[PDB]
From a paper:
Peptidase-containing ABC transporters (PCATs) in gram-positive bacteria function both as maturation proteases and exporters for biofilm formation, quorum sensing, or antimicrobial polypeptides. Substrates of PCATs are synthesized as precursors with an N-terminal leader peptide. Proteolytic cleavage of the leader peptide at the conserved double-glycine motif is necessary for secretion of the cargo peptide. In this work, we determined the structures of wild-type PCAT1 (wtPCAT1) in the presence of substrate and ATP with or without Mg2+.
To analyze the conformational states of PCAT1 under ATP turnover conditions, cryo-EM samples were prepared using wtPCAT1 mixed with twofold molar excess of the substrate CtA, 10 mM ATP-Mg2+, and the creatine phosphate ATP-regenerating system. Among the 671,000 particles analyzed by three-dimensional (3D) classification, ∼83% exhibit IF conformations with different degrees of NBD separation, 14% are in an NBD-dimerized configuration, and the remaining 3% do not show any protein features. Subsequent refinement resulted in a low-resolution (6.6-Å) NBD-dimerized structure and three molecular structures of NBD-separated IF conformations, referred to as IF wide (IFW, 4.1 Å), intermediate (IFI, 3.7 Å), and narrow (IFN, 3.7 Å), respectively. The three IF structures share a similar overall conformation, in which the two PEP domains dock symmetrically onto the intracellular openings of the TM cavity. The leader peptide (residues 8 to 24) of the substrate forms an L-shaped structure wrapping around the PEP domain. The double-glycine cleavage site (G23/G24) is positioned on a narrow cleft on PEP in close proximity to the catalytic triad residues C21, H99, and D115. Consistently, the density inside the TM cavity is separated from both leader peptides, indicating that the cargo peptide inside the TM cavity has been freed from its leader peptide. Densities consistent with ATP and Mg2+ were observed in all three reconstructions. Different from the NBD-dimerized structure, in the NBD-separated conformations, ATP binds to the Walker A/B motifs of one NBD, distant from the ABC signature motif of the opposite NBD. The majority of PCAT1 adopts an IF conformation in which the NBDs are separated, the substrate is enclosed inside the TM cavity, and the PEP domains remain associated with the transporter core.
Residue numbers in the entry:
A (entry chain C), B (entry chain D): 8 to 24
C (entry chain A), D (entry chain B): 8 to 722
Write the structure that this text describes.
Amino acid sequence: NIGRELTDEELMEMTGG
Amino acid sequence: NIGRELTDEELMEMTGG
Amino acid sequence: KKYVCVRQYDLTDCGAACLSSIAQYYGLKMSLAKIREMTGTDTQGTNAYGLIHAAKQLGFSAKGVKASKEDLLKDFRLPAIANVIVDNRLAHFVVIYSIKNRIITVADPGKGIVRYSMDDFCSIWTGGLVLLEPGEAFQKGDYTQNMMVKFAGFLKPLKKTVLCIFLASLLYTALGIAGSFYIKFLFDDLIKFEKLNDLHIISAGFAVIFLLQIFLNYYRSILVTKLGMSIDKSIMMEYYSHVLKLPMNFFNSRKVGEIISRFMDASKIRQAISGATLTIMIDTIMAVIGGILLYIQNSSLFFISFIIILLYGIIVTVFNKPIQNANRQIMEDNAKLTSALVESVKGIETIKSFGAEEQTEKSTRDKIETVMKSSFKEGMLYINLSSLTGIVAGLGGIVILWAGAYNVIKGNMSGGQLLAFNALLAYFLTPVKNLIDLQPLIQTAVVASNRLGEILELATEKELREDSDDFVISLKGDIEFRNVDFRYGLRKPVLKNINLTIPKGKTVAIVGESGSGKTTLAKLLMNFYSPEKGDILINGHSIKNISLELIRKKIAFVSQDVFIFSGTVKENLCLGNENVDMDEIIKAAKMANAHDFIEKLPLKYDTFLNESGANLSEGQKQRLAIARALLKKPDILILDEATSNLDSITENHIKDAIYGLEDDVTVIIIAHRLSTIVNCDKIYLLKDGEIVESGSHTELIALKGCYFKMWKQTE
Amino acid sequence: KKYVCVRQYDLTDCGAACLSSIAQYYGLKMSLAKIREMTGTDTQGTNAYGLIHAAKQLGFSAKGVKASKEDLLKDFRLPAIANVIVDNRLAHFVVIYSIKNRIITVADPGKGIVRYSMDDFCSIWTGGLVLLEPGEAFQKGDYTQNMMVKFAGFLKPLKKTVLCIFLASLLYTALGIAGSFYIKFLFDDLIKFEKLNDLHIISAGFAVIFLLQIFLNYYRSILVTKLGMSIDKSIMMEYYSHVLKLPMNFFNSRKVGEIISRFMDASKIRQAISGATLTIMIDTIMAVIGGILLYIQNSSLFFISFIIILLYGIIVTVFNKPIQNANRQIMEDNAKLTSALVESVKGIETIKSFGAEEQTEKSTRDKIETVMKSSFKEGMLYINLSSLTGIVAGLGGIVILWAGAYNVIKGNMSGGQLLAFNALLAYFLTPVKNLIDLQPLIQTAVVASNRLGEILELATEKELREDSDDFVISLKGDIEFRNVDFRYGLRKPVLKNINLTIPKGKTVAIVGESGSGKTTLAKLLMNFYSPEKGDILINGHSIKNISLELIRKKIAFVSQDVFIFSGTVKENLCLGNENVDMDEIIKAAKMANAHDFIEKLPLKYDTFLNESGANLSEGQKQRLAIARALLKKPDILILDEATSNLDSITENHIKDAIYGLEDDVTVIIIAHRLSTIVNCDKIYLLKDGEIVESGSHTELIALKGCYFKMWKQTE
Ligand SMILES: Nc1ncnc2c1ncn2[C@@H]1O[C@H](COP(=O)(O)OP(=O)(O)OP(=O)(O)O)[C@@H](O)[C@H]1O
Ligand SMILES: Nc1ncnc2c1ncn2[C@@H]1O[C@H](COP(=O)(O)OP(=O)(O)OP(=O)(O)O)[C@@H](O)[C@H]1O
Ligand SMILES: [Mg+2]
Ligand SMILES: [Mg+2]
């Protein structure tokens, strides 16, 4: 795709709100 | 006076608010 | 294709709002609360993993990929979700729609569609890209019921009141028309001829009509007030009764103010439900008849009035949106100063200790100046609107009189009818003005109805639960936790696979680290939550096999954080169940070591516990909790932090009381300190969400395992 | 003789208000906040002994005597203070004035003077009477400053703005009079004689006047807005700056909402400071000139209008008070409903556990029904007032027009002047209506100023301390506490006769039971309060000799609860002191065993701690508190609850590093758990509000006393 996919553990690091 | 003098211990019990 | 964005209902709805915006752009329209449950949104925020999982289970094919200035290559799909930071304050979610000429359209749930340039946007968002593609299972359709009619249906059993109000308003307008025409009859017949007797008769006969008008206004006011109060009360009853039946995850996911604000939202909904409908229904016909009468009077003056109301409507429409924008900005900037004040007052001790007074008074001043600046912007908008409206109204009033005088100069109408036209101008302009000004109320009310009625489509606990009252009698026997895996949301599993056996009539001591899950296991024991895999077995029957009411009635749990309700202590000890004698309360206090201090209170048992019982000490609150727990004689007694406070003998009394049951009821104690749990038949020591040692004290001491090591730690 | 009562500003201010009412009856007039200081008012309430002590200090001879339905016998002095209970809800204080014919006059701070009957009163209050007698040491006098003659002084440096506003308003009225008189020339000359050119000239010549009027209105509105915003900002800043310097007893006595409400009180004060004065100043002159003009036109119509406005004022005055009563009832019944909702939402877990859903739904319904009843009563009052005002206005409009027509027929004035009088009626009535409506605003504003300006007359921390720090530039040496007796208010003293010797550069451990006073002693070190008896000697000098700045700067105290301010972590570590380097911060982070987890944050030191750092764990909160404390490198370091959260290695590292200080700093460690304080140089055991054991571990164990008795556990 656009780039290399990130891992789930680092994916959890993304937060909203 | 009107009656016997009241003790301080139960005066602590007398609260307002 | 049209770009669609969904405004977030509350603060922490960025992910759900972005997902809804994507769905409504690709076609699907789902309810926002259901999506929030799908995304696993919590109070702190939404993890991107939860958003991706919700997208995948929804039907989208979604991926969370990194990006570093790679938004120029054609290798991408739009729209796409991004994460940003507000000048390094707090994280937020936006969605980019299209980038071209280094200028980008992004929907932010906070504001709406907002322009950005490449440099500033790149300096705003750090990294992260959520890409969404419609899958084969993606089915377009609409899943939201119109809730406006759902809330307006409360008017069905109240048709008499609104019919009476409509009739009274019609009579009000009919009587007001004569009062308007009065001045014309005055200046056309009662002046040009000196007929004093007719003057006295007519002036007295056109004054009682005003009294009838006042009586009609009184009746209308009473009816409208009663209708509004009834609708508000009914809506509040429905909302509260539905919220008290919602599951525990709804309460855990949201805050308190979010639930509370929907009570005030009931009045906003009622404003449309009650006021708007009657207002438009009467004002449309009254404006039509007023305009017809004005056309009968004159044509050019009616055209001038139509032009004036046209300019008024145009001005209101063009100035409406900045008013809401400024109001939202003020509400955002004055909610930051009030937080600083409370924070500064609460931590005044540390502020004084470190002497940070100058810093605090300098910091608060800047926030106050920002609030004042926002208020001044709103004042600027209001002053501009008022000045333009006043100019239009004054010019229309001057033009009407000039045109009437000019027509009289030619003589196209009588001189006295100009005054009657001026009088009827109010009756013609008021309803159309109300109709023009009703639009922001309708918008706010429909948003409010979408926000509040969103909750009412959720599923309660009764529906989810199945039936098991046909065979069950009580909750006695042996407790099995088999392969129980539970997630506290969409995060790492706090509880792992367990084979736990709690035998009949045995004291169980569950001990573990502070960060380990102990209270959560008790929560699943009473079935506040549902495990994703595994089962809870009672007498060879699963959780799906035990009736809800039986679980609630036969299990008593003393919370870590005891909550004391406002009211009498008697109501506190025996709540939920009635028709209980005082003897049970007396013995509950006796084995709870509560009879000693309760007698000291001014009232024996009718003492009112104000401020949620904050006057009483923590140990007294614990004693009350214990008394309430054993007042219900439950089958399963799960203590959590009863021994937190003790007088070196009260724990001895409570241990003697627990030993004094003479029944096979099972008591499970969650233990932090190990000295309290001695001579215990069964102890379960947990590390990393797993019970390792299962046995009595002696053999596990001899085992030479982590249990004795923890002892080498506590000692 | 006149009877006077004092309305309480806050909920828990009954005793001080009653004492002030007694004083203002005997002659003295003291400030309410100062009386609160003498009476020892706390959050819970005021004790009767507190009132007696305050009266004795003030000069009264006071006695608290019991009573059992003995209010008939003579030889007891009225007025007297009594304690009542409101239908078994909460205690409150009233003052009884006169007894006669079994009917009683009592002043209640909540409402005012309220009638009571013998049976009802005797069934309301249980027992207890405070009798007050003016002694020889009582001198009547007035000590209360006029609050307004202080807040209006803020208008002194802004004379230009108010002068411009006054001139703009005068020009506005002058231009409006011409627009009013326009209709007279319109209907007297321009219609009777067909002067079309003159009509065109006059119509254009009376249109620019309205444009100038609009421009003047814009300018005056801008100036008023700017003036009001400036006054609000100044008042708020001054109030906050004065509050931030008040002593700790003021903060401990009151809650947070009490402090916060005075910020919104500034707007209420400004509405009188800015709006009321200019409003009355302009309406007086415009009403005067309008009345003179109307009298020039006609006398009978002017007198009828005067009667109309007199009737309107009479109705407003007679209906003013019930509106306030209904508003107070709604406010007090609406602050009880929100309490039930908040506790129900917070304690939803207990409600689900005990299944008390129907009870909560039934309970909330009654409160909401009471709220609706109060709202309906206020609405009915509003409807009555509006109906009467409308009747008066309509009847006045009818009679004025009828009398004008009668005068025109008889020939007392021209026809066109009647419309001129009708137009000028607005300019005559609106200013007087505003003047009439201004009175409740002035009353509530003077009450608000007395509420807010009362605090500003208090004495801050700096004034009481002796201004002499010469002799000592650093806080080193020997610490000695000599017979230090501290009372936390008007309760039993928590600290008794003590003799403490903290040696030169010695790490000492204060141990005691939870109910014993340990943190209070540390606060006495920090000089948050002032000892009543005894003294604190530091290297041969007392606290009152040494300056407050050195005490605040060179002494660090770790609070029981770790309060983390919202903002960047860097500012939190170094607040109060600036120009601070980074490497000592790094070594402090290593010192607190906190440098490890900072890298795990997304940003190293620029991360913003939202919600006062609620996301961070309690152990991390303690680590940051320790880092903040030791960044200041104090001479006296007070650890209180550092060891609360443990990983079995963190306290080992903290102890090893504390042993690695190589300096003569004095460290005081407050200990709850006994095993935490091992091989300590000095241990002070505190019980019965006094130090009992003073020695090292070995000799205290060999002593076979209370310390070894406490070591019966933890083995
Ligand atoms: N909002 C939350 N409330 C409670 N626990 C949470 C929450 N979010 C995550 N958790 C995790 O769920 C588990 C609950 O732990 P449990 O309440 O059983 O322990 P405890 O011994 O009572 O201690 P503590 O309350 O101090 O965590 C912990 O692993 C905790 O980290
Ligand atoms: N409003 C109050 N705030 C704090 N202490 C109060 C208050 N009213 C009375 N006290 C008394 O002041 C003393 C304070 O000692 P303190 O409780 O602070 O020691 P401590 O070790 O902090 O105890 P704890 O940790 O349990 O609070 C106690 O006697 C307490 O009962
Ligand atoms: Mg816990
Ligand atoms: Mg403490």
